[PDB]
């Protein structure tokens with residue numbers, strides 16, 4: 100499996116590692132890839148795309164790297180399963196509500212409720228691991 104993410108200070112990156120740990124504990128393998136090093140053709144071979152990005156600017160996806168990546172794959176993911184996650188700071192998840200609506204609009208099947216954690220996942224560590232386990236069970 101593959102987890103692609105963008106993280107500005109490391110919060111979403113930490114979530115990614117924990118979600119990976121959950122998948123691995125379930126007995127499967129998984130690679131975490133920062134959005135800047137992703138190979139789209141390979142990524143499209145996956146049955147489930149696990150994507151993460153923190154809330155940026157004003158409730159939107161990071162603009163210089165993550166957003167273009169989503170635009171890039173938008174036309175080639177109809178019918179694919181996707182799981183979404185990310186950290187946020189002061190809002191209440193508007194950027195994630197929009198991200199989920201967007202992926203749905205592209206024809207994707209959002210397999211689970213998106214996982215959002217405020218700031219660093221300290222207390223939510225197990226929640227991240229459990230999300231990974233849910234994904235590994237699909």
Ligand SMILES: Cc1cc2nc3c(=O)[nH]c(=O)nc-3n(C[C@H](O)[C@H](O)[C@H](O)COP(=O)(O)O)c2cc1C
Nearest residue numbers: 106107108109110111153154156158187188189190
């Ligand atoms: C320029 C900038 C804009 C942000 N905009 C939002 C926002 O609209 N809503 C929110 O809840 N957090 C916002 N945040 C806070 C981050 O989403 C939050 O600090 C998160 O934990 C960062 O995760 P990361 O280290 O994975 O990037 C913003 C942070 C920065 C740096």
